[PDB]
Protein backbone atom coordinates (compact mmCIF):
# COMPACT_ATOMS: atom_id res chain seq x y z
CA UNK A 1 0.00 0.00 0.00
CA UNK A 2 1.75 3.28 -1.53
CA UNK A 3 -1.31 5.18 -0.03
CA UNK A 4 -4.66 4.40 1.17
CA UNK A 5 -7.04 6.91 0.38
CA UNK A 6 -7.71 9.75 -2.21
CA UNK A 7 -4.55 11.63 -3.97
CA UNK A 8 -5.37 14.62 -5.90
CA UNK A 9 -2.47 15.92 -7.98
CA UNK A 10 -2.02 18.97 -9.71
CA UNK A 11 0.34 18.48 -12.79
CA UNK A 12 1.53 21.13 -13.97
CA UNK A 13 2.13 20.82 -17.59
CA UNK A 14 1.30 23.52 -19.17
CA UNK A 15 2.35 26.26 -21.62
CA UNK A 16 3.04 29.29 -20.00
CA UNK A 17 2.98 32.76 -21.45
CA UNK A 18 5.57 35.80 -21.84
CA UNK A 19 5.32 38.87 -21.19
CA UNK A 20 7.88 42.01 -22.29
CA UNK A 21 9.68 44.05 -19.76
CA UNK A 22 8.11 47.48 -20.94
CA UNK A 23 10.78 48.81 -23.09
CA UNK A 24 10.91 52.30 -22.46
CA UNK A 25 12.32 52.81 -19.15
CA UNK A 26 15.06 55.56 -19.56
CA UNK A 27 18.50 55.71 -18.00
CA UNK A 28 19.23 59.18 -17.07
CA UNK A 29 22.61 60.89 -15.19
CA UNK A 30 23.13 64.73 -15.00
CA UNK A 31 24.19 67.09 -12.63
CA UNK A 32 22.34 69.05 -9.59
CA UNK A 33 22.88 70.56 -6.91
CA UNK A 34 21.97 68.72 -3.79
CA UNK A 35 20.71 70.98 -0.78
CA UNK A 36 17.02 71.67 1.01
CA UNK A 37 14.84 71.44 -2.07
CA UNK A 38 16.79 68.79 -3.80
CA UNK A 39 15.86 65.32 -1.79
CA UNK A 40 18.27 62.77 -3.57
CA UNK A 41 21.57 61.98 -2.59
CA UNK A 42 24.07 62.82 -5.10
CA UNK A 43 24.77 59.37 -6.51
CA UNK A 44 21.67 57.29 -5.75
CA UNK A 45 19.58 56.43 -8.36
CA UNK A 46 15.60 58.08 -7.74
CA UNK A 47 12.73 56.31 -9.50
CA UNK A 48 10.80 59.04 -11.41
CA UNK A 49 7.45 58.65 -13.51
CA UNK A 50 6.10 62.39 -13.73
CA UNK A 51 7.66 66.01 -13.93
CA UNK A 52 6.29 66.90 -10.69
CA UNK A 53 8.62 64.19 -8.98
CA UNK A 54 11.69 64.93 -10.73
CA UNK A 55 11.66 68.51 -9.58
CA UNK A 56 10.89 67.38 -6.22
CA UNK A 57 14.03 65.12 -6.39
CA UNK A 58 16.23 67.04 -8.11
CA UNK A 59 15.17 70.98 -7.63
CA UNK A 60 13.78 73.70 -10.61
CA UNK A 61 17.12 74.40 -11.64
CA UNK A 62 18.94 71.78 -11.98
CA UNK A 63 20.49 70.50 -15.32
CA UNK A 64 18.51 67.04 -14.80
CA UNK A 65 15.53 68.10 -14.65
CA UNK A 66 15.80 69.99 -17.38
CA UNK A 67 16.94 66.21 -18.93
CA UNK A 68 13.13 64.71 -17.02
CA UNK A 69 11.17 68.11 -18.51
CA UNK A 70 12.49 67.17 -22.15
CA UNK A 71 11.21 63.75 -21.82
CA UNK A 72 7.82 64.38 -19.70
CA UNK A 73 6.83 67.13 -22.26
CA UNK A 74 6.62 64.41 -25.41
CA UNK A 75 5.86 61.30 -23.43
CA UNK A 76 5.44 60.15 -20.05
CA UNK A 77 7.50 57.14 -18.95
CA UNK A 78 9.81 55.54 -16.17
CA UNK A 79 13.00 57.75 -15.41
CA UNK A 80 15.89 56.27 -13.63
CA UNK A 81 17.63 59.32 -13.12
CA UNK A 82 21.16 59.08 -10.64
CA UNK A 83 21.77 62.76 -10.47
CA UNK A 84 25.64 63.80 -9.57
CA UNK A 85 26.99 67.30 -7.97
CA UNK A 86 28.63 69.99 -9.99
CA UNK A 87 32.21 69.54 -9.87
CA UNK A 88 34.47 72.48 -10.61
CA UNK A 89 36.38 72.17 -13.99
CA UNK A 90 34.54 70.50 -16.89
CA UNK A 91 36.79 67.76 -17.05
CA UNK A 92 36.50 66.16 -13.30
CA UNK A 93 32.46 66.71 -14.22
CA UNK A 94 33.16 63.85 -17.14
CA UNK A 95 34.72 61.62 -14.61
CA UNK A 96 31.55 62.08 -12.18
CA UNK A 97 29.29 60.87 -14.90
CA UNK A 98 31.44 58.26 -15.69
CA UNK A 99 31.42 57.39 -12.11
CA UNK A 100 32.85 53.72 -11.61
CA UNK A 101 33.00 52.64 -7.53
CA UNK A 102 33.26 54.33 -4.27
CA UNK A 103 35.44 53.51 -1.28
CA UNK A 104 32.18 52.58 0.30
CA UNK A 105 31.47 49.87 -2.09
CA UNK A 106 28.74 51.12 -4.07
CA UNK A 107 28.35 52.31 -7.61
CA UNK A 108 28.07 56.27 -7.82
CA UNK A 109 28.14 57.43 -11.60
CA UNK A 110 26.39 55.79 -15.02
CA UNK A 111 26.97 52.24 -13.21
CA UNK A 112 24.24 53.45 -10.68
CA UNK A 113 21.68 52.56 -13.50
CA UNK A 114 22.74 48.78 -13.46
CA UNK A 115 20.98 49.13 -10.07
CA UNK A 116 18.05 50.05 -11.62
CA UNK A 117 16.73 46.70 -11.50
CA UNK A 118 17.60 45.49 -8.31
CA UNK A 119 16.03 48.34 -6.21
CA UNK A 120 12.91 49.49 -9.20
CA UNK A 121 12.78 46.18 -11.06
CA UNK A 122 12.83 48.35 -14.05
CA UNK A 123 15.87 47.99 -15.62
CA UNK A 124 16.32 51.39 -18.21
CA UNK A 125 16.79 50.69 -22.18
CA UNK A 126 17.32 53.87 -23.08
CA UNK A 127 20.74 55.38 -21.71
CA UNK A 128 20.74 58.85 -21.92
CA UNK A 129 23.38 61.30 -20.33
CA UNK A 130 22.50 64.78 -22.03
CA UNK A 131 25.43 67.11 -22.57
CA UNK A 132 28.16 64.95 -21.55
CA UNK A 133 27.96 62.67 -23.71
CA UNK A 134 29.62 64.82 -26.17
CA UNK A 135 33.14 63.60 -24.29
CA UNK A 136 34.62 60.76 -26.13
CA UNK A 137 35.45 59.21 -22.35
CA UNK A 138 31.77 59.77 -20.85
CA UNK A 139 30.06 58.21 -24.30
CA UNK A 140 32.72 55.03 -24.35
CA UNK A 141 31.31 54.37 -20.40
CA UNK A 142 28.17 54.52 -21.38
CA UNK A 143 28.38 52.29 -24.54
CA UNK A 144 30.24 49.45 -21.99
CA UNK A 145 26.89 50.21 -19.79
CA UNK A 146 24.28 49.50 -22.87
CA UNK A 147 25.07 46.12 -23.32
CA UNK A 148 25.29 45.07 -19.88
CA UNK A 149 22.06 46.91 -19.66
CA UNK A 150 21.04 45.80 -23.57
CA UNK A 151 20.25 49.33 -24.06
CA UNK A 152 20.40 52.04 -26.76
CA UNK A 153 22.43 54.49 -25.50
CA UNK A 154 21.32 57.93 -26.78
CA UNK A 155 24.59 59.94 -27.84
CA UNK A 156 24.60 63.75 -28.74
CA UNK A 157 27.91 64.71 -30.91
CA UNK A 158 29.58 68.19 -30.57
CA UNK A 159 27.65 71.33 -31.62
CA UNK A 160 30.33 72.81 -34.29
CA UNK A 161 29.88 71.65 -37.81
CA UNK A 162 29.40 68.05 -39.90
CA UNK A 163 33.23 67.75 -39.85
CA UNK A 164 33.09 67.58 -36.64
CA UNK A 165 30.33 65.37 -36.03
CA UNK A 166 31.44 62.78 -38.77
CA UNK A 167 34.75 62.71 -36.79
CA UNK A 168 32.71 62.15 -33.73
CA UNK A 169 30.49 59.23 -34.53
CA UNK A 170 33.87 57.25 -36.34
CA UNK A 171 35.05 56.93 -32.70
CA UNK A 172 32.43 54.26 -31.71
CA UNK A 173 31.13 51.89 -34.55
CA UNK A 174 29.06 50.05 -31.71
CA UNK A 175 25.01 48.88 -32.30
CA UNK A 176 23.95 50.06 -28.73
CA UNK A 177 24.66 53.75 -29.62
CA UNK A 178 22.25 56.11 -31.35
CA UNK A 179 24.05 59.61 -32.13
CA UNK A 180 21.62 62.86 -32.68
CA UNK A 181 23.63 66.06 -33.83
CA UNK A 182 22.46 69.18 -34.04
CA UNK A 183 21.77 71.07 -30.85
CA UNK A 184 18.02 71.60 -30.01
CA UNK A 185 17.47 75.53 -29.11
CA UNK A 186 14.75 75.44 -26.73
CA UNK A 187 13.49 77.74 -24.43
CA UNK A 188 14.97 78.65 -21.05
CA UNK A 189 12.37 79.60 -18.30
CA UNK A 190 15.27 80.56 -15.95
CA UNK A 191 17.28 83.22 -18.11
CA UNK A 192 14.18 83.93 -20.16
CA UNK A 193 15.87 83.28 -23.85
CA UNK A 194 16.54 80.92 -26.14
CA UNK A 195 19.40 78.33 -24.55
CA UNK A 196 21.15 75.48 -26.68
CA UNK A 197 19.91 71.95 -25.40
CA UNK A 198 22.03 69.29 -25.98
CA UNK A 199 19.62 67.43 -27.81
CA UNK A 200 19.82 63.70 -26.64
CA UNK A 201 16.54 63.79 -23.71
CA UNK A 202 14.60 65.21 -26.76
CA UNK A 203 15.58 62.07 -28.53
CA UNK A 204 14.69 59.95 -25.32
CA UNK A 205 10.92 61.36 -25.21
CA UNK A 206 10.87 60.67 -28.62
CA UNK A 207 11.71 56.76 -28.25
CA UNK A 208 9.52 56.55 -24.84
CA UNK A 209 6.67 58.04 -26.98
CA UNK A 210 6.79 55.53 -30.18
CA UNK A 211 6.49 52.80 -27.46
CA UNK A 212 3.45 54.49 -26.55
CA UNK A 213 1.68 55.34 -29.22
CA UNK A 214 3.06 53.16 -32.36
CA UNK A 215 4.90 50.09 -30.14
CA UNK A 216 8.59 49.39 -29.56
CA UNK A 217 9.02 48.04 -33.27
CA UNK A 218 8.56 51.73 -34.71
CA UNK A 219 11.61 53.82 -35.34
CA UNK A 220 11.33 57.39 -33.75
CA UNK A 221 12.42 58.91 -37.28
CA UNK A 222 9.77 60.84 -38.46
CA UNK A 223 7.88 61.70 -35.52
CA UNK A 224 7.67 64.98 -34.03
CA UNK A 225 9.82 67.18 -31.33
CA UNK A 226 7.56 69.12 -29.26
CA UNK A 227 9.26 71.73 -26.90
CA UNK A 228 12.11 72.32 -29.55
CA UNK A 229 11.73 76.00 -30.96
CA UNK A 230 14.55 76.23 -33.47
CA UNK A 231 18.13 74.19 -33.78
CA UNK A 232 21.70 75.53 -33.75
CA UNK A 233 23.28 75.22 -37.30
CA UNK A 234 20.08 74.34 -38.91
CA UNK A 235 20.52 71.34 -41.29
CA UNK A 236 19.30 70.91 -44.77
CA UNK A 237 16.32 69.04 -45.98
CA UNK A 238 14.75 70.69 -49.27
CA UNK A 239 12.62 68.42 -51.34
CA UNK A 240 14.03 64.72 -52.42
CA UNK A 241 17.90 65.57 -52.96
CA UNK A 242 19.81 62.79 -52.12
CA UNK A 243 23.08 65.16 -51.27
CA UNK A 244 21.15 67.67 -48.69
CA UNK A 245 23.06 68.47 -45.74
CA UNK A 246 21.18 66.08 -43.37
CA UNK A 247 20.83 63.38 -45.61
CA UNK A 248 24.76 63.35 -45.43
CA UNK A 249 24.88 62.78 -41.61
CA UNK A 250 22.06 59.99 -41.88
CA UNK A 251 24.96 58.32 -44.39
CA UNK A 252 27.12 58.70 -41.84
CA UNK A 253 24.95 56.98 -39.13
CA UNK A 254 24.05 59.95 -37.58
CA UNK A 255 20.20 61.17 -37.16
CA UNK A 256 19.69 64.95 -37.36
CA UNK A 257 16.81 67.01 -36.86
CA UNK A 258 15.69 68.43 -39.58
CA UNK A 259 12.98 70.95 -40.66
CA UNK A 260 12.06 75.05 -39.91
CA UNK A 261 13.13 75.50 -36.26
CA UNK A 262 13.54 71.42 -35.81
CA UNK A 263 10.11 69.50 -35.52
CA UNK A 264 10.91 66.43 -37.04
CA UNK A 265 13.59 63.39 -35.87
CA UNK A 266 15.49 62.28 -38.85
CA UNK A 267 17.51 59.05 -38.84
CA UNK A 268 16.94 55.26 -38.00
CA UNK A 269 20.70 54.29 -38.02
CA UNK A 270 22.35 53.52 -35.17
CA UNK A 271 26.32 53.39 -34.82
CA UNK A 272 27.08 49.87 -35.98
CA UNK A 273 29.73 48.52 -38.57
CA UNK A 274 27.68 45.39 -39.12
CA UNK A 275 24.75 46.30 -41.83
CA UNK A 276 22.81 43.85 -39.92
CA UNK A 277 22.07 45.78 -36.80
CA UNK A 278 21.81 49.22 -38.35
CA UNK A 279 18.40 49.98 -37.78
CA UNK A 280 17.57 51.00 -34.39
CA UNK A 281 14.49 48.95 -34.77
CA UNK A 282 15.86 45.82 -35.74
CA UNK A 283 18.32 45.93 -32.19
CA UNK A 284 15.48 47.11 -30.06
CA UNK A 285 13.19 44.68 -30.53
CA UNK A 286 16.20 41.83 -30.32
CA UNK A 287 17.01 43.07 -27.19
CA UNK A 288 13.05 43.37 -26.02
CA UNK A 289 12.10 39.69 -27.51
CA UNK A 290 15.75 38.12 -25.48
CA UNK A 291 15.35 40.00 -22.23
CA UNK A 292 11.45 38.60 -22.37
CA UNK A 293 12.34 34.79 -22.98
CA UNK A 294 15.32 35.22 -20.32
CA UNK A 295 12.73 36.44 -17.66
CA UNK A 296 9.26 33.99 -18.94
CA UNK A 297 11.53 30.84 -18.53
CA UNK A 298 12.75 31.47 -15.26
CA UNK A 299 9.96 28.48 -14.27
CA UNK A 300 12.03 26.05 -16.44
CA UNK A 301 15.10 25.62 -14.51
CA UNK A 302 14.95 22.35 -13.45
CA UNK A 303 11.91 21.20 -14.93
CA UNK A 304 12.99 17.51 -16.12
CA UNK A 305 13.38 16.93 -19.72
CA UNK A 306 10.07 14.67 -20.71
CA UNK A 307 8.58 15.04 -23.74
CA UNK A 308 5.63 16.99 -22.67
CA UNK A 309 7.95 19.84 -21.56
CA UNK A 310 10.26 20.14 -24.96
CA UNK A 311 6.02 20.25 -26.46
CA UNK A 312 5.27 22.88 -23.65
CA UNK A 313 7.93 25.51 -23.83
CA UNK A 314 8.01 25.43 -28.08
CA UNK A 315 4.19 25.92 -27.49
CA UNK A 316 4.42 28.74 -24.99
CA UNK A 317 6.96 30.27 -27.48
CA UNK A 318 5.56 30.02 -30.62
CA UNK A 319 2.00 31.58 -28.97
CA UNK A 320 4.51 34.51 -28.01
CA UNK A 321 5.75 34.55 -31.29
CA UNK A 322 2.21 34.35 -33.04
CA UNK A 323 1.29 37.15 -30.56
CA UNK A 324 3.79 39.60 -31.76
CA UNK A 325 3.01 38.74 -35.51
CA UNK A 326 -0.56 40.00 -35.62
CA UNK A 327 0.91 43.20 -32.93
CA UNK A 328 2.93 44.03 -35.52
CA UNK A 329 6.36 43.47 -34.46
CA UNK A 330 7.55 40.56 -36.38
CA UNK A 331 6.56 39.27 -40.05
CA UNK A 332 6.93 35.68 -39.56
CA UNK A 333 8.61 33.24 -37.40
CA UNK A 334 9.62 29.71 -37.05
CA UNK A 335 9.96 28.25 -33.43
CA UNK A 336 11.39 24.60 -33.20
CA UNK A 337 13.21 22.57 -31.25
CA UNK A 338 16.53 22.39 -32.58
CA UNK A 339 16.77 18.90 -33.84
CA UNK A 340 20.73 18.55 -34.46
CA UNK A 341 21.58 20.77 -30.94
CA UNK A 342 19.50 18.40 -29.30
CA UNK A 343 22.26 15.31 -29.30
CA UNK A 344 21.50 12.37 -26.33
CA UNK A 345 24.80 13.84 -24.84
CA UNK A 346 23.92 17.48 -24.81
CA UNK A 347 20.46 16.63 -23.07
CA UNK A 348 21.93 13.86 -20.69
CA UNK A 349 23.83 16.83 -19.32
CA UNK A 350 20.57 18.91 -18.71
CA UNK A 351 21.35 21.37 -21.74
CA UNK A 352 18.46 21.78 -24.49
CA UNK A 353 18.32 23.72 -27.32
CA UNK A 354 15.19 25.96 -28.94
CA UNK A 355 15.53 28.20 -31.83
CA UNK A 356 13.66 31.39 -32.45
CA UNK A 357 14.16 32.48 -36.17
CA UNK A 358 12.09 35.89 -37.12
CA UNK A 359 11.98 38.95 -39.34
CA UNK A 360 12.00 42.18 -37.61
CA UNK A 361 9.50 44.85 -39.25
CA UNK A 362 12.16 47.02 -41.00
CA UNK A 363 10.89 50.89 -40.97
CA UNK A 364 10.70 51.93 -45.03
CA UNK A 365 13.32 54.48 -44.87
CA UNK A 366 13.12 55.29 -48.51
CA UNK A 367 10.20 54.79 -50.70
CA UNK A 368 10.99 54.78 -53.75
CA UNK A 369 8.10 55.25 -56.75
CA UNK A 370 8.60 54.48 -60.29
CA UNK A 371 6.42 56.61 -62.66
CA UNK A 372 5.82 56.68 -66.42
CA UNK A 373 3.98 57.96 -69.34
CA UNK A 374 3.20 55.19 -71.65
CA UNK A 375 0.44 54.84 -74.78
CA UNK A 376 -0.43 51.75 -73.57
CA UNK A 377 -3.99 52.39 -72.91
CA UNK A 378 -4.18 54.61 -75.87
CA UNK A 379 -5.72 52.68 -78.05
CA UNK A 380 -8.60 52.40 -75.19
CA UNK A 381 -9.80 55.72 -76.43
CA UNK A 382 -12.52 54.09 -79.37
CA UNK A 383 -15.19 53.23 -77.64
CA UNK B 1 5.67 63.19 -59.59
CA UNK B 2 5.41 66.30 -57.43
CA UNK B 3 2.17 65.69 -55.72
CA UNK B 4 3.68 61.69 -54.99
CA UNK B 5 6.95 63.05 -53.39
CA UNK B 6 5.23 66.06 -51.10
CA UNK B 7 2.16 63.32 -50.54
CA UNK B 8 3.92 60.51 -49.03
CA UNK B 9 6.55 62.50 -46.20
CA UNK B 10 4.16 60.25 -43.72
CA UNK B 11 5.38 56.81 -44.96
CA UNK B 12 9.38 57.31 -44.65
CA UNK B 13 9.31 56.05 -41.68
CA UNK B 14 6.68 53.69 -41.01
CA UNK B 15 7.93 50.40 -41.17
CA UNK B 16 7.05 48.08 -44.17
CA UNK B 17 3.57 45.78 -42.83
CA UNK B 18 1.78 43.93 -44.85
CA UNK B 19 -1.16 46.51 -43.78
CA UNK B 20 1.35 49.53 -45.41
CA UNK B 21 2.40 48.13 -49.22
CA UNK B 22 -1.49 47.26 -49.44
CA UNK B 23 -2.45 51.00 -47.91
CA UNK B 24 -0.08 52.84 -49.65
CA UNK B 25 -0.91 51.09 -53.05
CA UNK B 26 -4.52 51.47 -52.17
CA UNK B 27 -3.78 55.30 -51.81
CA UNK B 28 -2.00 55.28 -55.01
CA UNK B 29 -4.70 53.55 -57.06
CA UNK B 30 -7.41 56.26 -55.89
CA UNK B 31 -4.96 59.31 -56.42
CA UNK B 32 -4.78 58.19 -59.87
CA UNK B 33 -8.34 56.94 -59.82
CA UNK B 34 -9.62 60.42 -59.02
CA UNK B 35 -7.28 61.16 -61.64
CA UNK B 36 -8.87 59.31 -64.28
CA UNK B 37 -12.38 60.14 -63.88
CA UNK B 38 -11.43 63.40 -63.77
CA UNK B 39 -10.18 63.05 -67.67
CA UNK B 40 -5.91 63.80 -66.89
CA UNK B 41 -5.27 60.26 -67.78
CA UNK B 42 -7.14 57.48 -69.92
CA UNK B 43 -5.80 54.09 -67.87
CA UNK B 44 -3.28 53.49 -65.55
CA UNK B 45 -1.35 50.41 -63.17
CA UNK B 46 -0.21 50.84 -59.83
CA UNK B 47 1.57 47.65 -58.27
CA UNK B 48 4.39 47.07 -55.99
CA UNK C 1 19.18 -11.92 -20.63
CA UNK C 2 19.86 -13.82 -23.63
CA UNK C 3 24.03 -14.51 -23.11
CA UNK C 4 23.88 -14.29 -18.96
CA UNK C 5 21.09 -17.42 -18.82
CA UNK C 6 23.44 -19.99 -20.33
CA UNK C 7 22.89 -23.69 -19.38
CA UNK C 8 25.14 -24.05 -16.66
CA UNK C 9 24.18 -20.65 -15.33
CA UNK C 10 20.50 -21.95 -15.11
CA UNK C 11 21.55 -25.24 -13.86
CA UNK C 12 23.46 -23.39 -10.95
CA UNK C 13 19.75 -21.62 -10.15
CA UNK C 14 20.80 -18.03 -11.60
CA UNK C 15 18.66 -16.64 -14.00
CA UNK C 16 19.38 -12.78 -14.95
CA UNK C 17 16.85 -10.32 -16.54
CA UNK C 18 18.35 -7.09 -18.04
CA UNK C 19 16.64 -3.91 -17.00
CA UNK C 20 17.75 -1.20 -19.59
CA UNK C 21 15.81 2.53 -18.87
CA UNK C 22 16.54 5.96 -19.41
CA UNK C 23 15.45 8.70 -16.64
CA UNK C 24 14.24 12.02 -17.41
CA UNK C 25 17.72 14.67 -17.14
CA UNK C 26 16.77 17.65 -15.06
CA UNK C 27 16.52 20.59 -17.98
CA UNK C 28 19.06 22.58 -16.02
CA UNK C 29 19.87 24.73 -18.91
CA UNK C 30 17.45 25.72 -21.44
CA UNK C 31 19.27 27.15 -24.13
CA UNK C 32 16.98 29.92 -26.77
CA UNK C 33 18.65 30.70 -29.78
CA UNK C 34 16.86 33.80 -31.26
CA UNK C 35 18.10 35.13 -35.03
CA UNK C 36 16.85 38.07 -36.85
CA UNK C 37 16.33 36.96 -40.78
CA UNK C 38 15.22 38.41 -44.01
CA UNK C 39 13.76 35.08 -45.03
CA UNK C 40 9.56 35.93 -44.93
CA UNK C 41 10.46 39.66 -45.38
CA UNK C 42 9.20 38.93 -49.41
CA UNK C 43 5.87 38.10 -47.92
CA UNK C 44 4.76 41.79 -47.47
CA UNK C 45 3.69 41.62 -51.30
CA UNK C 46 0.24 40.20 -50.95
Redesign the interface.
Known amino acids: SFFHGVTVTNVDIGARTIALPASSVIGLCDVFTPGAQASAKPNVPVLLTSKKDAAAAFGIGSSIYLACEAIYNRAQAVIVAVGVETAETPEAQASAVIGGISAAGERTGLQALLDGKSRFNAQPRLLVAPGHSAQQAVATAMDGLAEKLRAIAILDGPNSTDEAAVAYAKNFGSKRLFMVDPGVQVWDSATNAARNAPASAYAAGLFAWTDAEYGF??????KEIKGVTGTSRPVEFL??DETCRANLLNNANIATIIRDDGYRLWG?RTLSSDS?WAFV??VR??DL??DA??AG?KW???????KT?VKD?TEG?RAFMRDLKNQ?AV???EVYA?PD?NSASQ?????????????????????N?R?EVTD???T??LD
Open positions: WSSPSNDGNKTRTMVMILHAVDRGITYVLGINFDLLAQGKVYWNIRFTDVPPAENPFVQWLEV
